Write a protein that binds this DNA or RNA. Structure first.
Ligand code: FES
Ligand SMILES: [K+]
Ligand SMILES: [K+]
Ligand SMILES: [Mg+2]
Ligand SMILES: [Mg+2]
Ligand SMILES: [Mg+2]
Ligand SMILES: [Mg+2]
Ligand SMILES: [Mg+2]
Ligand SMILES: [Mg+2]
Ligand SMILES: [Mg+2]
Ligand SMILES: [Mg+2]
Ligand SMILES: [Mg+2]
Ligand SMILES: [Mg+2]
Lengths: 97, 137, 86, 100, 122
RNA sequence: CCCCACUAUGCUUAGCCCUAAACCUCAACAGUUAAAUCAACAAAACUGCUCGCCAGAACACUACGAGCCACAGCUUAAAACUCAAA
C-alpha cells in the first residue's frame, strides 16, 4: 500500500526498568554491615522503603534478615553498631538541621 | 577535626577529654521527667550517688511539681550538691516526656554544670505490659 | 538493659550549646517515630481504634502528598500575567 | 504525486528527534514579561525561562537561544481527576544564546 | 535437608574451643548429619549481654557449621545445644544458599489508581 | 463520668458454649463497558446462570413446639389485640 505508514512494534526508546541498589544481590543475616546501613544510628529502627529506596522484595528480605540477626546474636537492636557508622550512606534521611 | 554528634566508643582511642577525663569517666545526671514530678540523680561513672533532688524535695506539692520552673529548681539543687563534690562536666540521661524534661537540664547548667552529651532513655516496650485504659473526657 | 549504654539516642554537645543538642535529639526521636509512639502508649489504644487511626493517617498522607504534588506542579504558573489587558 | 500526511509526519524534524528529554534545541524569544522569557522552539507549546543573570540584556524579542528540552508538554493526573491537568507550556532549560 | 548452624561459643582458649567444636560436630554426626564445612567468623563482642548457664557473656566465638541432616535431627540437635555449657547461643536455619533467588527485571511503576469514584457531578 | 486498691476475666492445658455492626451490611461462577449511563446517596451501569433470602409497621433477637454437654442459654420462630403509617 504505502511505505510511509506507521508500523506496529514495541517502544524502541523505552528505558530499562530501574533496579534497587540490592537487585540481584543476596541479603544474608550474617552480613551485619549491610543490614546496619538500613537501621537508624540513634535508635536502631528499621527504615521504611521510602527512606531506603529498596523494592518490596528487598525491603522484606532486609527486614527479615535484620530481625533474624538481632535475635540470633549478630546485630544490636537499640542502636546501630558504631563500627558501621562510617559506611556509605544509602538512605535518604538527614537528622542534623 | 570535624565535630561528631556520635559519642566516643569505649575501648577505642579518642582524643576528646574533659578536665583530663575521658567520656567513660564523666559523671552521669539521671533525669526522670514524669508527668507529675521530676527526679534528678547525679552519679559517678562507677555508679556512686553524688546528689539527688526532685520537685517534691524542693518544697513543691501536687500540681506545682509537674511544671517547668519546678524542675528547673530541682536541677539547681542537685547541681549545687554535685558541684560541692567536684563535678563540673556531666552526661545527661533523661527518661520521660514530662514538663521537666528540658527545664531540669537548664537548672543543671544554671547551677554550674557543663553538659557534654544528652541521652534519651525513655522506656519504649517492643510489644510489654498493657497500659491502663483510655480516659473518657 | 543488656545493650551497651551511651550509644542509643545520644547526642554530643558542641561548644556548650545544649539547646541545639536537645533540639537535635528531639528531632531524631521525632523522625524515628519514638515521640508519637511514647505518647500513644500512655493509655492502651484498643486494636479497633488503632486500625481506625492508622487508616486515617494513611489516607491523610496520600491526600497531603497528592495535594503537595499538585501545588509544586502548578507553582510555575504563579508568574505575572503575560496577557494583561486581554 | 502529492505528498501524503503520513510522509510529512515521518520526515518531520520533530518526529525524527524522538524523545524530547535532554535534547538540545534552538528557540526564539517572542514575548517577554519582566524577567520571564517566552521561547518558541518549534513544538506545540512554548517554554518560559527566567532571564539569565549574566548578559541578561542580550536576551530580547527575536533573540535565538539554546535550550535543553525536558518535556514537550507539562501534564499530570492528580488524585481523583478524570483527565490530566496541563499547564499549556513546555519544560526546558535555557542554556544561553546561539551565535554564528 | 541442608542447614546452617550459627554457633556462638563461650570465649575460651584454643584447646577448649577445639574440644567444643569437635564435641558439637560429633553430636551432629551421631544424629545422622553429613557435615559439609566449618567456618570461623572470629571472636567479637556480642551485640548485647547474653546470660547462659548461670553466666554472663560479653564476648563469644562465632562459628558456622554447614551440614545436611534428616528433618528429625534438627529438633534433637537443638536440645543438645541447650545443655552444652560452652555454647552461648546456637540456632539452626535452613541454608541460605539452597534458596535460589528469582531473577528481577526491575521496578514496575505503579500508576495512580483510576475510576475509584463515579464521574457524576458532586 | 475523674483518682487509688483489688478480684472474676484476659494466658496455658483439657473439655464446653456457638454468639457479633461475624458488615467490605454489596452471594458463587462466567462475561461486557455499547446501547437508555443512572430515582437519591453510597463503592459507575449491566448481562448470563445458580443457590439462599425478602413481601406494611409494631407485637418480636418474643410466646409455644422441637433440637442442643447449652438450664437466667442458643437455633428455628408465630398469632391475637393495635396503627395509617413505618
Ligand atoms: S529491584 Fe530487583 S530485587 Fe529490588
Ligand atoms: K449474625
Ligand atoms: K462494617
Ligand atoms: Mg487475676
Ligand atoms: Mg503468650
Ligand atoms: Mg470482622
Ligand atoms: Mg449479613
Ligand atoms: Mg453460595
Ligand atoms: Mg465476575
Ligand atoms: Mg412484616
Ligand atoms: Mg441475640
Ligand atoms: Mg428466645
Ligand atoms: Mg421454649
Amino acid at each position: 500500500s504505502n511505505e510511509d505508514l506507521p508500523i506496529s512494534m514495541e517502544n524502541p526508546y523505552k528505558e530499562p526498568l530501574k533496579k534497587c541498589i540490592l537487585c540481584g544481590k543476596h541479603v544474608d543475616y550474617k552480613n551485619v554491615q549491610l543490614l546496619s546501613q538500613f537501621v537508624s544510628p540513634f535508635t536502631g529502627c528499621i527504615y521504611g522503603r521510602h527512606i531506603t529506596g529498596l523494592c518490596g522484595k528487598k525491603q522484606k528480605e532486609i527486614t527479615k534478615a535484620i530481625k533474624r540477626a538481632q535475635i540470633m546474636g549478630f546485630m544490636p537492636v537499640t542502636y546501630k553498631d558504631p563500627a558501621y557508622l562510617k559506611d556509605p550512606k544509602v538512605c535518604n534521611i538527614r537528622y542534623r538541621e | 577535626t570535624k565535630f561528631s554528634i556520635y559519642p566516643p566508643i569505649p575501648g577505642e582511642e579518642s582524643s576528646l577529654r574533659w578536665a583530663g577525663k575521658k567520656f567513660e569517666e564523666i559523671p552521669i545526671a539521671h533525669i526522670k521527667a514524669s508527668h507529675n514530678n521530676t527526679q534528678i540523680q547525679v552519679v559517678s561513672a562507677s555508679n556512686e550517688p553524688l546528689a539527688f533532688a526532685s520537685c517534691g524535695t524542693e518544697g513543691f506539692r501536687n500540681a506545682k511539681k509537674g511544671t517547668g520552673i519546678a524542675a528547673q529548681t530541682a536541677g539547681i539543687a542537685a547541681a549545687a550538691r554535685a558541684k560541692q563534690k567536684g563535678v563540673i562536666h556531666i552526661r545527661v540521661v533523661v527518661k520521660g516526656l514530662g514538663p521537666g524534661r528540658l527545664s531540669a537540664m537548664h537548672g543543671l547548667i544554671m547551677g554550674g554544670l557543663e553538659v557534654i552529651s544528652i541521652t534519651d532513655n525513655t522506656p519504649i516496650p517492643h510489644x510489654g505490659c498493657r497500659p491502663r485504659k483510655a480516659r473518657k473526657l | 538493659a543488656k545493650h551497651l549504654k551511651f550509644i542509643a539516642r545520644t547526642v554530643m554537645v558542641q561548644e556548650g550549646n545544649v539547646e541545639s543538642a536537645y533540639r537535635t535529639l528531639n528531632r531524631i526521636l521525632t523522625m524515628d517515630g519514638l515521640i508519637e509512639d511514647i505518647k500513644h502508649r500512655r493509655y492502651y489504644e484498643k486494636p479497633c481504634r488503632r486500625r481506625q487511626r492508622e487508616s486515617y493517617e494513611r489516607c491523610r498522607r496520600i491526600y497531603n502528598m497528592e495535594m503537595a504534588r499538585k501545588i509544586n506542579f502548578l507553582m510555575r504558573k504563579n508568574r505575572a500575567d503575560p496577557w494583561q489587558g486581554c | 504525486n502529492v505528498e501524503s500526511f503520513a510522509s510529512m509526519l515521518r520526515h518531520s524534524p520533530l518526529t525524527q528527534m524522538g524523545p524530547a528529554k535532554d535534547k538540545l534545541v534552538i528557540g526564539r524569544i517572542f514575548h517577554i514579561v519582566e524577567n520571564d522569557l517566552y521561547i518558541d522552539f518549534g513544538g506545540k507549546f512554548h517554554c518560559v525561562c527566567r532571564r539569565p543573570e549574566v548578559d541578561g540584556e542580550k536576551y530580547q524579542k527575536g533573540t535565538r537561544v539554546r535550550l535543553r528540552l525536558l518535556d514537550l508538554e507539562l501534564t499530570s493526573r492528580f488524585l481523583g481527576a478524570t483527565t490530566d491537568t496541563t499547564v499549556l507550556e513546555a519544560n526546558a532549560v535555557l542554556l544561553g544564546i546561539q551565535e554564528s | 535437608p541442608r542447614y546452617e548452624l550459627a554457633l556462638i561459643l563461650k570465649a575460651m582458649q584454643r584447646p577448649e574451643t577445639a574440644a567444643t567444636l569437635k564435641r558439637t560436630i560429633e553430636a551432629l554426626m551421631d544424629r545422622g548429619a553429613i557435615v559439609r564445612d566449618l567456618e570461623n567468623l572470629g571472636e567479637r563482642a556480642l551485640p548485647y549481654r547474653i546470660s547462659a548457664h548461670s553466666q554472663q557473656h560479653n564476648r563469644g566465638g562465632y562459628f558456622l557449621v554447614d551440614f545436611y541432616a534428616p528433618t528429625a535431627a534438627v529438633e534433637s540437635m537443638v536440645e543438645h545445644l541447650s545443655r552444652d555449657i560452652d555454647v552461648i547461643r546456637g540456632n539452626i536455619v535452613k541454608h541460605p544458599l539452597t534458596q535460589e533467588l528469582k531473577e528481577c527485571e526491575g521496578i514496575v511503576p505503579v500508576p495512580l489508581a483510576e475510576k475509584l469514584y463515579s464521574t457524576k457531578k458532586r
